[PDB]
Amino acid sequence: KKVLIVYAHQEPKSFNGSLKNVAVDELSRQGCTVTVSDLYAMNLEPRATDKDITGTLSNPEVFNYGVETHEAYKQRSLASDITDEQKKVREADLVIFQFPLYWFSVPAILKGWMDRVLCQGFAFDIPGFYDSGLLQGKLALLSVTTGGTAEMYTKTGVNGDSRYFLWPLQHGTLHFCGFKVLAPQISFAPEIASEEERKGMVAAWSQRLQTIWKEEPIPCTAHWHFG
Amino acid sequence: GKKVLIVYAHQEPKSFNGSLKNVAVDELSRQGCTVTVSDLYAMNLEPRATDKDITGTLSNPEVFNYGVETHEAYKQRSLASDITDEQKKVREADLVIFQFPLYWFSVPAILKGWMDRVLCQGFAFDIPGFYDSGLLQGKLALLSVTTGGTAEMYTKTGVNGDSRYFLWPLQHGTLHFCGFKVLAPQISFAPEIASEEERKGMVAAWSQRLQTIWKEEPIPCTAHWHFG
Numbered sequence: 001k002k003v004l005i006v007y008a009h010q011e012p013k014s015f016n017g018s019l020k021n022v023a024v025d026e027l028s029r030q031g032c033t034v035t036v037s038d039l040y041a042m043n044l045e046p047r048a049t050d051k052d053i054t055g056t057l058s059n060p061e062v063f064n065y066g067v068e069t070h071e072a073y074k075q076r077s078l079a080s081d082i083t084d085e086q087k088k089v090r091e092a093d094l095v096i097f098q099f100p101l102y103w104f105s106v107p108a109i110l111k112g113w114m115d116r117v118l119c120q121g122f123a124f125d126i127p128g129f130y131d132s133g134l135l136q137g138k139l140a141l142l143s144v145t146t147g148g149t150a151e152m153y154t155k156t157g158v159n160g161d162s163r164y165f166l167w168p169l170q171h172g173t174l175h176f177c178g179f180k181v182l183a184p185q186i187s188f189a190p191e192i193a194s195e196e197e198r199k200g201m202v203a204a205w206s207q208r209l210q211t212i213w214k215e216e217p218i219p220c221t222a223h224w225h226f227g
Numbered sequence: 228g229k230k231v232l233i234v235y236a237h238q239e240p241k242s243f244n245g246s247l248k249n250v251a252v253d254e255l256s257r258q259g260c261t262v263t264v265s266d267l268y269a270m271n272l273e274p275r276a277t278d279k280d281i282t283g284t285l286s287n288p289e290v291f292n293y294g295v296e297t298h299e300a301y302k303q304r305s306l307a308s309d310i311t312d313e314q315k316k317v318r319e320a321d322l323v324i325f326q327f328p329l330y331w332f333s334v335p336a337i338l339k340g341w342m343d344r345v346l347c348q349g350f351a352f353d354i355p356g357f358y359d360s361g362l363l364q365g366k367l368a369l370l371s372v373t374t375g376g377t378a379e380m381y382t383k384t385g386v387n388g389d390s391r392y393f394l395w396p397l398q399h400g401t402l403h404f405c406g407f408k409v410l411a412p413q414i415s416f417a418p419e420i421a422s423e424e425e426r427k428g429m430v431a432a433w434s435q436r437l438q439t440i441w442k443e444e445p446i447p448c449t450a451h452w453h454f455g
């Protein structure tokens with residue numbers, strides 16, 4: 001089994017850093033093939049621009065990013081950074097995303113990865129989205145840290161249920177491309193939590209990774225996310 | 228004399244998004260509003276949250292915490308000039324319009340970068356000082372979004388779910404959290420699939436709405452509004 005970890009934190013000693021390393025350690029220990037895209041260390045280009053196609057653009061007078069990258073994929077003309085990430089995803093049976101929550105979503109660097117890597121022809125098609133997505137057969141999993149407490153992330157809480165913010169990512173992106181989505185790993189409020197609680201959150205993540213291949217995916221539906 | 232900031236995120240001036248931005252500029256300018264546009268792609272705005280965003284001595288130089296460092300940087304007036312210039316535009320604005328195509332049920336990463344880097348602690352919010360006590364209280368925000376998906380795809384029964392589901396992180400999680408009152412979103416569904424005559428109608432509808440934009444009340448930005 002082959003695992004891609006897409007990681008988006010600036011600081012290796014971070015709680016996010018620890019969770020990534022524990023995933024590398026434990027998956028490597030089981031005998032999985034492990035790859036890590038450390039996006040900040042790669043200085044990954046997040047912007048969707050014409051630099052993402054290498055050669056003459058199909059319509060040079062009026063640039064349409066969606067249309068041009070789809071044609072570029074079919075012609076094998078995408079920038080090498082995109083195509084290298086596409087190779088890693090194509091080979092991967094499981095893709096883990098490790099990141100701190102930025103404005104109820106992924107950090108922009110990781111948003112850029114999503115925007116640029118998962119292009120038409122590679123991740124989806126028409127037809128070929130949701131259960132018919134082109135990355136069907138693969139598993140995705142969001143491992144997210146938050147500043148907000150668990151109690152803030154409830155239906156009655158001030159931020160709403162944590163499942164509300166997962167919708168664009170799990171359904172809108174991952175399910176749309178054909179991933180089956182495993183339950184998210186949410187490590188609430190490591191900054192506020194005690195060191196002993198932090199250790200428990202890391203141990204729980206380690207523990208889960210031991211049996212990750214036997215898990216069932218969630219039913220990625222409106223009903224799951226919104227009750 | 229009302230002041231409008233348009234944060235615009237499309238690569239191509241002749242785009243449908245471009246047209247909507249220009250019509251907003253034209254119509255708001257015609258009313259006598261002060262109009263400013265942050266064209267993010269033309270500015271080549273840095274989207275990445277890195278240590279380059281602080282120009283000064285870091286509170287903890289051995290272990291970098293972006294949140295903690297940018298908060299201290301704001302108080303010390305030590306943020307990168309691109310951040311502080313956008314902060315000035317927002318501080319002056321009475322209304323901030325965001326114009327963008329929907330990218331993966333959200334904003335394009337360039338615009339996500341603007342949100343991550345501009346709306347830092349001390350400027351946009353504080354602890355306490357968020358949601359109704361946010362530091363940008365008194366201001367209005369409005370999302371003008373285009374989609375590839377049809378209106379019918381963006382319903383509760385539809386395959387993408389209700390459009391209000393994807394607005395939650397943006398309107399509540401970001402804008403409300405900073406103290407903006409949120410005006411109803413402008414959603415221009417599926418311009419690529421629509422006929423030219425339908426496209427013209429969608430632009431004219433946006434123009435028409437902007438004529439009376441100052442008499443509108445904000446939505447109640449609640450869980451109940453988005454999910455009820």
Ligand SMILES: Cc1cc2nc3c(=O)[nH]c(=O)nc-3n(C[C@H](O)[C@H](O)[C@H](O)COP(=O)(O)OP(=O)(O)OC[C@H]3O[C@@H](n4cnc5c(N)ncnc54)[C@H](O)[C@@H]3O)c2cc1C
Nearest residue numbers: 014015016018100101102103104145146147148191198294
């Ligand atoms: C632009 C921006 C937007 C944000 N938006 C949101 C939002 O919308 N909603 C929200 O809830 N939050 C938000 N946050 C907060 C953010 O999600 C948290 O700060 C982040 O998730 C914390 O993760 P971290 O890895 O940086 O924690 P850290 O600060 O790195 O970790 C906390 C502590 O854990 C320690 N640690 C590391 N490894 C271990 C280990 N193995 N065992 C024990 N302890 C360890 C660290 O040394 C540190 O003391 C935002 C932050 C920023 C900068």
Ligand SMILES: Cc1cc2nc3c(=O)[nH]c(=O)nc-3n(C[C@H](O)[C@H](O)[C@H](O)COP(=O)(O)OP(=O)(O)OC[C@H]3O[C@@H](n4cnc5c(N)ncnc54)[C@H](O)[C@@H]3O)c2cc1C
Nearest residue numbers: 066242243244246328329330331332373374375376419426
């Ligand atoms: C990375 C990526 C992710 C995406 N994710 C999503 C998603 O999650 N959900 C989703 O629904 N969609 C998604 N899309 C699709 C995207 O949202 C649409 O392609 C976009 O919203 C359409 O806006 P546009 O301005 O690019 O349209 P354009 O292609 O610019 O416009 C369509 C046509 O209108 C014409 N036009 C321009 N101005 C006028 C005018 N004044 N009058 C008449 N005609 C005019 C143009 O010439 C053009 O032929 C994604 C696209 C990309 C590239």
Ligand SMILES: C[C@@H](c1ccc2nccn2c1)n1nnc2ncc(-c3cnn(C)c3)nc21
Nearest residue numbers: 103147148149152159294295347348354404
């Ligand atoms: C940090 C966390 C939070 C907010 C208030 C609070 N009072 C006691 C504990 N608290 C924790 N929080 N909860 N929702 C959030 N949304 C956004 C952010 C945020 C945005 N930028 N940064 C640096 C943090 N922080 C958020």
Ligand SMILES: C[C@@H](c1ccc2nccn2c1)n1nnc2ncc(-c3cnn(C)c3)nc21
Nearest residue numbers: 066115118119120126176331375376377387
């Ligand atoms: C293309 C558009 C779409 C797909 C199917 C369909 N049938 C009738 C109209 N339709 C419109 N669409 N609908 N939801 C989408 N979500 C995402 C994307 C997309 C485009 N580029 N990328 C990278 C994602 N496109 C999307």
Ligand SMILES: [Zn+2]
Nearest residue numbers: 171175220221
């Ligand atoms: Zn789903």
Ligand SMILES: [Zn+2]
Nearest residue numbers: 399403448449
């Ligand atoms: Zn709200």
